[PDB]
Amino acid sequence: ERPTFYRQELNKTIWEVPERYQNLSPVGSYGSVCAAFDTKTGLRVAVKKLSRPFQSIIHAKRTYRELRLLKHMKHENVIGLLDVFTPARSLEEFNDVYLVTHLMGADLNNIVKCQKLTDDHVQFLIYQILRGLKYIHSADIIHRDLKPSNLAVNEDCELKILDFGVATRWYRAPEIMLNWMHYNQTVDIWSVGCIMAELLTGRTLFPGTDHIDQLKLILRLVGTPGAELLKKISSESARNYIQSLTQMPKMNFANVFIGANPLAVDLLEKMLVLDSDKRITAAQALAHAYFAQYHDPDDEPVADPYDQSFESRDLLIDEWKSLTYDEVISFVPPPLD
Ligand SMILES: Nc1ccc2c(NC3CC3)nc(-c3ccccc3)nc2c1
Numbered sequence: 009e010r011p012t013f014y015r016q017e018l019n020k021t022i023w024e025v026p027e028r029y030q031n032l033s034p035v036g037s038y039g040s041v042c043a044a045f046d047t048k049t050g051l052r053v054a055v056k057k058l059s060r061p062f063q064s065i066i067h068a069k070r071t072y073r074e075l076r077l078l079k080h081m082k083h084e085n086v087i088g089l090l091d092v093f094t095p096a097r098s099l100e101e102f103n104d105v106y107l108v109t110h111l112m113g114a115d116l117n118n119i120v121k122c123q124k125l126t127d128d129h130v131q132f133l134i135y136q137i138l139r140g141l142k143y144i145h146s147a148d149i150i151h152r153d154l155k156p157s158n159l160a161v162n163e164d165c166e167l168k169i170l171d172f173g174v175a176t177r178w179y180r181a182p183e184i185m186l187n188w189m190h191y192n193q194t195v196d197i198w199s200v201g202c203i204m205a206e207l208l209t210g211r212t213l214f215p216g217t218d219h220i221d222q223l224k225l226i227l228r229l230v231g232t233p234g235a236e237l238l239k240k241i242s243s244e245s246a247r248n249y250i251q252s253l254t255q256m257p258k259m260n261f262a263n264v265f266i267g268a269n270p271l272a273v274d275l276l277e278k279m280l281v282l283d284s285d286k287r288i289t290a291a292q293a294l295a296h297a298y299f300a301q302y303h304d305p306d307d308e309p310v311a312d313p314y315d316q317s318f319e320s321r322d323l324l325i326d327e328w329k330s331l332t333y334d335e336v337i338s339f340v341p342p343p344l345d
């Protein structure tokens with residue numbers, strides 16, 4: 009059954025892919041990525057060759073994790089696995105992992121950094137993010153690093169979230185900035201709020217220079233923690249940090265986001281709540297007035313359960329390697345339409 013591979017050297021790396029994929033062309037650089045043409049479907053695809061996937065425990069488990077995650081995602085607004093393959097003929101030979109996904113035109117970083125989107129474009133793009141997040145979250149997966157560059161958009165404005173499971177810090181929830189161990193799914197909602205803000209204004213909402221500055225900018229908009237939040241904070245030094253700060257009052261968002269659709273201001277108030285317990289969830293946000301023209305309760309599907317019990321396991325390099333090998337072998341290509 010094994011297909012015929014061909015070798016080439018793309019830039020500073022060897023590539024060995026099936027004949028199925030042609031006209032490889034570098035597009036960027038966890039591993040490096042080529043644009044290719046896929047002869048089986050006639051679509052443009054991205055092929056990512058992982059860098060040294062099994063050189064350490066950490067790499068080996070990370071390779072396994074990303075493969076497991078990609079194999080699980082089956083939703084219109086989340087990147088999924090078109091193919092995965094290795095040039096190796098046996099487990100003992102197994103050393104290279106390549107992943108195949110649809111090639112999307114651009115990332116949100118691009119569409120925002122060149123220009124300022126209209127309100128109906130913001131609605132549609134934020135809607136799609138929330139729709140993919142609902143799905144991701146229903147599986148008990150947290151993305152943790154949502155940001156414009158992890159959001160792929162084609163020329164049709166269809167959006168797909170990538171990399172689940174321009175400074176990263178600018179989109180992070182303040183509980184992460186403060187290193188809380190038990191933060192949950194709404195760290196992603198925070199990030200969406202920051203992105204949505206940025207799409208409406210054309211400017212990074214919280215462009216901190218570091219973790220302290222990042223917090224300062226955040227508290228300045230959302231205000232310093234109240235007593236109700238403060239009494240939920242287990243860490244003494246953390247509690248003493250924020251409590252030693254200059255008591256900033258919550259800003260009225262309608263005055264910071266002057267002239268924006270007030271339904272958007274209101275959704276932003278609900279996403280950018282300091283206390284993560286009170287922050288709107290993805291499911292709830294979808295039913296918000298602001299998404300009136302897109303929301304459909306019958307077409308916002310949830311995911312199948314995802315087994316992440318592996319995350320708490322300590323295994324040898326060779327054991328994670330063999331588990332990854334198993335997943336390459338059992339891969340069933342997605343239905344062709
Ligand atoms: N139920 C909760 C709700 C919010 C929390 C929060 N929020 C930080 C203001 C952003 N921070 C922390 C925490 C715990 C230990 C060390 C550092 C931070 N815990 C929280 C527990």
Ligand SMILES: O=c1c2ccccc2ncn1-c1ccccc1
Binds near residue numbers: 054109
């Ligand atoms: O890594 C990319 C990628 C990088 C730059 C431009 C477009 C891209 N499209 C898809 N992927 C990708 C490929 C495989 C697994 C996860 C993401």
